[PDB]
Amino acid sequence: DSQSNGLLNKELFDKVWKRLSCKEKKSGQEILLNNLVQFYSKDTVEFVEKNIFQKIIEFGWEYYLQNGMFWNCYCRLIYFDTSRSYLDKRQYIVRKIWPQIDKKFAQSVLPSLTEFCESYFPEEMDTLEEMFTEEP
Amino acid sequence: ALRGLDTQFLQDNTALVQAYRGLDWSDISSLTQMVDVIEQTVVKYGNPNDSIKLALETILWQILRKYPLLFGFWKRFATIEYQLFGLKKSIAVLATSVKWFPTSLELWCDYLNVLCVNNPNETDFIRNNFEIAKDLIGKQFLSHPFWDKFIEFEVGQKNWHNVQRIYEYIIEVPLHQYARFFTSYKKFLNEKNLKTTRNIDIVLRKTQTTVNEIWQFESKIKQPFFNLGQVLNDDLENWSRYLYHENTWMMYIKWLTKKNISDEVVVDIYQKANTFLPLDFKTLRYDFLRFLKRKYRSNNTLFNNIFNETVSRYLKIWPNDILLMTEYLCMLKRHSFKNSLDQSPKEILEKQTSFTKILETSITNYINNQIDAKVHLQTLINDKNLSIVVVELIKTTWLVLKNNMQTRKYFNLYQKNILIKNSVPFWLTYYKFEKSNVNFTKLNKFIRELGVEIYLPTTVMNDILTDYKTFYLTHSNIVTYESSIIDSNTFDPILYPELKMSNPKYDPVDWHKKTEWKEAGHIGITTERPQISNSIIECNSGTLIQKPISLPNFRNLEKINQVKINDLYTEEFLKE
Amino acid sequence: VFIGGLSSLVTEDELRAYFQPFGTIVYVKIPVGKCCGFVQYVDRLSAEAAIAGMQGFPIANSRVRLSWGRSAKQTALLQQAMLSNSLQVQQQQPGLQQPNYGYIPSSTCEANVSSTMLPGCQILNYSNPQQVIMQGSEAVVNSTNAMLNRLEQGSNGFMFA
């Protein structure tokens, strides 16, 4: 659909990934994340979700799991994708992103994820509040 | 505003009824009308308030005399002077008497009995009780007054051990251990009270307020919280607040939230701080809104109605504020149209289309100036807050129902309205929409128009130009850029955002009479400066020798002393 | 600056959003319904840039009138001494007690420091409301990160400014 491959050229994405790998020592990680989620397509978003976000989960790095901007961006990638309908993007977010965030991190992740769920999913706000209620 | 003149007018109108010696039904109702206008305007301190209750009682208006007492209790929490009078009256009453007399007594006992100066209130109820022949009821008030740290506690103890000749020490051990434990607390409390009793002196200073010791007293009753505390810190806040200070309210609410009483008590305190506090504080109010959102999960139906009446009352007083409108609309989408993932999808999609339908009929109703007060959203729309409703309609039409044709039709319709052509979330939603589709034609036409015909705040224009340059550099190639360059506007999306940042009014492409020349060295102060008409200082001296130089022509030689000032400040604001 | 001719439908935060990128800003109080405001900057240079750049720009569809104008204290002083019409004399605004070496005027920073204090950089700055901060290294990261925050929250409606 006539899309120039932006940051995800294999010569530039290595320069991105060697800086995302340093994880707190280098400043400005959030802007690299936030500039890698504007693709809004099928296979482009599928590349981004298969290569950065899934791999940060797979390594289990604590800086990005701790940080609420990471999960806000990983929701905002899928939700602005114009290849899915409403039901499958909402069900994908609530069923397979939000379970993965660890409950010990919820005090930092919930203030950033709450603004997302309050802006775009006011109906599914009670599910997110009951996933992180103070009593299990 | 003039609380002194409102004090003076009631002091003058009462002195007109009193010295003309008549009932004076004009001035009787005028002093009552001056009382009603004052009490609605001012919280009416109990010492001033008592005279109004005394005069109406002197005018024998029993049903109205009871109702002003309830208002007095709301106005002053430490109003034991109004509490005792309301207990002194309503004993001269009808058949409901015996039940009402204890009802006002027990309501004051939950209001004032934990105060150090509360010894008169229990004694008066004891006086009411001793006038009855319910010596069992007199005995119950005796044991309760023994257990609370009061002024004349030892005086009460010895007196109750002689008047009760029939049943004095049926349980010696229980009564004296409660009395001595009361004496342990009152010995403790004597440190703070005497530190308060030696500072309160009206000299129009911080000692009359006793705020340092009141913050000391409230602090030391917070930590040693032996469960009288929540009543005690209420009693501690009551004497400290009466001496408007919203920070004291925030500390009392923070302590009471940490103490975990039932939430309706907290809602009562929140409503009282909403009522008696002055407007524009804007910090405990949004605290109340987010408490109503957080506690919504426990009990469903009544908190929606508390929330709804709160947001309506806060668009009464801050109509220019917009976070209330989107907050109301978030709660409306959650409560009224709720549908989980587990439900079948036609139900979900019909609830979304119902929400789009009510929202569109709301804004279409308000633009064409026909109102429908049955639906609460129709009432809540204000023209400062209309734009966020249009934004919710756009974002719901585009991101949920997912039709781009209908979304573009709404953009092309509503960007021509007066109220929302200069709104920030409408245009910034438009930017996110025409960024989602990756086309640059609408984005170049948008940011080429961003200063001249779409007026946004300069912080938002700077944010849009920075993010659009960052977006264009990473999503567009040279073959698109070199065909995007047109010369009549000298527009180029790489460099034009770098020049248009801080100055909004930027046109891209007889000098001596512009308003940049005339006030050159000094802004605002305009002076036509003298200059030579045909100056030769640009001409080199290698070319001045070729032909002889003419005489100078002058312009503006009359005005080396005239300097003139457009003083907007004095004219439009000092002299109105 | 005296900003005159306001719509009266404009708040103080929305008025801070216009006049902030010209330079750092001590206060932005506006009277209740006189249809005119008051903005005060730290720098004379930034205030002159604001009068140049924002002259006649429409805030909520009314062409605005920018000029000079005193504070709130001096305005109360002139109002009572004009109702008594005695003198109405003003007082000069306080100086920066120069030579001052850290500060490069008309500059904004929004939020451990081992800076090499060299000339091209900036060393000291006024904090945004107020106090004085040693300028850190990472100004652009905090600034760009806050504007991405401001875009994503302003599109949904949590700040009209």
Side-chain angles (χ1 to χ4, degrees), chain A residues 1-9 12-17 19-48 50-102 104-122 125-136, chain B residues 1 4 15 19 22 46 48 55 68 72 78 86 92 95 102 120 133 138 145 156 174 179 224 229 244-245 247-257 260-271 273-294 296-312 314-384 386-415 417-481 483-491 493-576, chain C residues 1-137 139-161:
Chain A
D1 200 74
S2 295
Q3 295 178 359
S4 57
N5 46 357
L7 272 302
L8 36 79
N9 204 171
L12 292 172
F13 185 76
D14 291 334
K15 290 180 186 292
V16 168
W17 184 256
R19 192 171 181 86
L20 284 169
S21 176
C22 295
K23 292 191 263 76
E24 63 264 16
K25 303 178 182 69
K26 304 289 105 177
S27 62
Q29 304 288 105
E30 314 296 328
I31 310 171
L32 267 298
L33 290 172
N34 202 358
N35 269 296
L36 259 142
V37 327
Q38 335 235 268
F39 295 122
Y40 319 153
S41 180
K42 178 65 172 179
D43 48 356
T44 320
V45 168
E46 189 174 1
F47 187 86
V48 176
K50 195 260 286 181
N51 286 111
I52 50 166
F53 291 101
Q54 197 76 47
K55 193 184 280 185
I56 303 297
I57 298 166
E58 175 181 357
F59 279 90
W61 286 342
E62 190 188 3
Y63 181 86
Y64 299 99
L65 269 284
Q66 179 69 257
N67 197 0
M69 192 69 197
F70 179 75
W71 294 104
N72 196 4
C73 289
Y74 183 47
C75 295
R76 198 173 67 240
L77 174 61
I78 279 93
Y79 189 68
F80 284 87
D81 190 349
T82 62
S83 183
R84 297 175 176 90
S85 292
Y86 180 73
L87 274 304
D88 40 354
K89 69 175 73 169
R90 177 180 174 179
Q91 190 178 5
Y92 186 79
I93 294 167
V94 183
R95 292 283 189 263
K96 287 193 282 291
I97 286 94
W98 289 351
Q100 300 183 6
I101 69 176
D102 193 356
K104 66 177 182 179
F105 287 153
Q107 199 276 129
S108 74
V109 181
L110 188 144
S112 173
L113 186 60
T114 295
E115 190 267 326
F116 171 72
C117 190
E118 184 169 356
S119 298
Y120 296 103
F121 287 153
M125 184 63 203
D126 194 79
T127 299
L128 188 272
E129 186 65 29
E130 287 180 350
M131 286 173 68
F132 281 162
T133 180
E134 56 182 358
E135 48 189 3
Chain B
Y244 282 94
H245 288 84
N247 195 5
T248 301
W249 289 97
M250 298 177 189
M251 294 303 290
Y252 175 63
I253 289 296
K254 174 182 179 290
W255 174 250
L256 205 145
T257 298
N260 194 2
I261 313 176
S262 173
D263 53 354
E264 57 90 17
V265 177
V266 191
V267 172
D268 289 328
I269 306 161
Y270 267 151
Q271 292 297 114
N274 195 358
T275 308
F276 295 107
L277 241 211
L279 352 127
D280 98 48
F281 288 14
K282 189 178 303 228
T283 306
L284 187 143
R285 273 71 182 262
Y286 288 91
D287 172 70
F288 178 65
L289 270 307
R290 75 187 72 255
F291 173 71
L292 257 289
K293 291 179 68 65
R294 179 175 59 242
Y296 171 78
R297 186 171 62 86
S298 68
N299 196 354
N300 193 1
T301 305
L302 82 159
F303 281 169
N304 192 13
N305 210 159
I306 292 173
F307 186 89
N308 207 167
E309 301 298 326
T310 298
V311 175
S312 297
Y314 292 173
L315 273 86
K316 295 298 176 291
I317 68 171
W318 293 287
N320 293 316
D321 199 78
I322 201 170
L323 181 55
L324 270 308
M325 186 67 205
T326 174
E327 193 63 43
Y328 172 73
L329 205 153
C330 174
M331 180 62 76
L332 184 141
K333 180 69 184 297
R334 170 166 50 178
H335 187 280
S336 293
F337 299 144
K338 61 192 294 181
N339 41 356
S340 178
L341 269 299
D342 304 336
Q343 193 171 3
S344 175
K346 191 63 67 179
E347 285 78 359
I348 293 172
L349 204 282
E350 180 59 32
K351 300 302 283 294
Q352 309 301 324
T353 310
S354 175
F355 178 62
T356 295
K357 179 174 71 176
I358 180 173
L359 206 62
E360 185 179 1
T361 55
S362 295
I363 58 168
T364 309
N365 213 166
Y366 184 75
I367 292 171
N368 300 119
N369 199 357
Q370 293 167 351
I371 204 63
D372 188 2
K374 301 286 103 173
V375 179
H376 198 74
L377 189 70
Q378 312 294 114
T379 303
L380 260 286
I381 285 168
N382 194 359
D383 57 352
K384 179 71 171 180
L386 190 154
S387 172
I388 216 156
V389 188
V390 174
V391 166
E392 293 292 328
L393 181 60
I394 299 300
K395 183 167 84 269
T396 305
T397 303
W398 161 51
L399 285 174
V400 186
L401 303 178
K402 196 182 179 292
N403 46 358
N404 290 323
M405 180 266 174
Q406 177 60 260
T407 299
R408 291 186 182 93
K409 189 179 80 68
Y410 286 120
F411 272 156
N412 295 321
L413 173 64
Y414 287 104
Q415 83 185 11
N417 199 0
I418 302 300
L419 302 170
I420 56 176
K421 73 175 77 172
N422 298 119
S423 176
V424 175
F426 174 74
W427 286 104
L428 217 150
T429 307
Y430 177 75
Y431 174 65
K432 190 187 284 187
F433 169 64
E434 292 289 332
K435 186 191 284 184
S436 178
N437 309 324
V438 75
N439 57 352
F440 302 109
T441 304
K442 292 287 185 180
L443 288 176
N444 290 128
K445 185 179 177 292
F446 167 60
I447 72 156
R448 193 169 67 238
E449 201 182 3
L450 190 61
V452 180
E453 210 168 6
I454 301 172
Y455 303 107
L456 292 179
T458 311
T459 303
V460 178
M461 177 184 72
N462 282 317
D463 299 333
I464 289 172
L465 290 166
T466 298
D467 199 3
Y468 177 69
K469 182 177 178 179
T470 296
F471 173 72
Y472 189 84
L473 265 306
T474 47
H475 284 86
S476 170
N477 51 5
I478 289 169
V479 188
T480 309
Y481 169 62
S483 66
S484 297
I485 292 172
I486 45 95
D487 291 328
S488 69
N489 296 323
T490 185
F491 177 80
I494 304 298
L495 188 142
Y496 179 85
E498 185 65 29
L499 294 182
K500 203 190 172 180
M501 276 183 70
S502 178
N503 47 353
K505 56 180 190 69
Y506 175 74
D507 52 346
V509 291
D510 55 352
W511 183 259
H512 69 278
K513 62 183 179 181
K514 292 188 185 294
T515 63
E516 290 91 7
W517 170 264
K518 287 180 180 178
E519 55 188 9
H522 44 275
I523 205 76
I525 310 169
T526 173
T527 174
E528 290 184 349
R529 69 185 71 252
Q531 64 180 357
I532 303 169
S533 179
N534 49 7
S535 292
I536 61 172
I537 62 174
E538 291 172 347
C539 293
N540 196 2
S541 176
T543 67
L544 291 183
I545 203 165
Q546 296 185 356
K547 59 177 289 294
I549 308 171
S550 65
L551 278 308
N553 282 322
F554 294 98
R555 66 179 70 179
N556 294 318
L557 259 292
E558 293 87 2
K559 299 184 177 70
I560 58 173
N561 288 318
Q562 185 171 3
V563 59
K564 66 182 288 182
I565 294 169
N566 200 172
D567 194 358
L568 288 167
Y569 176 75
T570 298
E571 297 178 359
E572 291 185 358
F573 180 66
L574 259 282
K575 299 176 183 181
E576 294 292 331
Chain C
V1 184
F2 170 79
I3 164 171
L6 285 169
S7 197
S8 102
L9 186 133
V10 51
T11 60
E12 304 178 1
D13 294 331
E14 185 180 359
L15 185 144
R16 178 174 284 174
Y18 283 96
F19 286 89
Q20 199 178 12
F22 296 105
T24 179
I25 168 170
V26 57
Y27 95 144
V28 239
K29 119 169 177 317
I30 126 183
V32 281
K34 309 291 194 295
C35 71
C36 61
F38 285 100
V39 184
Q40 178 172 359
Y41 295 98
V42 178
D43 287 324
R44 185 58 150 81
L45 189 272
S46 63
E48 286 181 355
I51 294 173
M54 197 58 66
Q55 182 63 253
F57 188 81
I59 292 98
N61 289 316
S62 70
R63 294 300 187 101
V64 87
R65 270 77 184 168
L66 294 184
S67 172
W68 299 108
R70 288 291 183 189
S71 175
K73 176 176 181 178
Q74 298 295 111
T75 304
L77 190 147
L78 293 174
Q79 280 176 351
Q80 67 92 29
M82 189 269 284
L83 292 176
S84 172
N85 63 15
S86 301
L87 288 174
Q88 53 190 353
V89 63
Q90 302 175 5
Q91 182 189 358
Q92 181 175 0
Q93 171 152 347
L96 213 152
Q97 178 37 211
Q98 282 165 352
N100 196 10
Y101 277 87
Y103 185 57
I104 294 170
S106 178
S107 69
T108 60
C109 174
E110 189 163 357
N112 51 2
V113 174
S114 70
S115 66
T116 61
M117 295 177 179
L118 285 179
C121 300
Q122 191 173 3
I123 307 101
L124 305 178
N125 197 4
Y126 287 87
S127 177
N128 192 0
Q130 186 180 2
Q131 62 184 358
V132 182
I133 62 171
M134 191 75 69
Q135 180 65 257
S137 179
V140 172
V141 176
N142 290 319
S143 176
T144 297
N145 204 355
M147 58 80 71
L148 286 175
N149 191 2
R150 189 178 301 116
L151 289 175
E152 182 66 26
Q153 289 181 355
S155 69
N156 299 324
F158 291 101
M159 55 185 73
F160 197 79

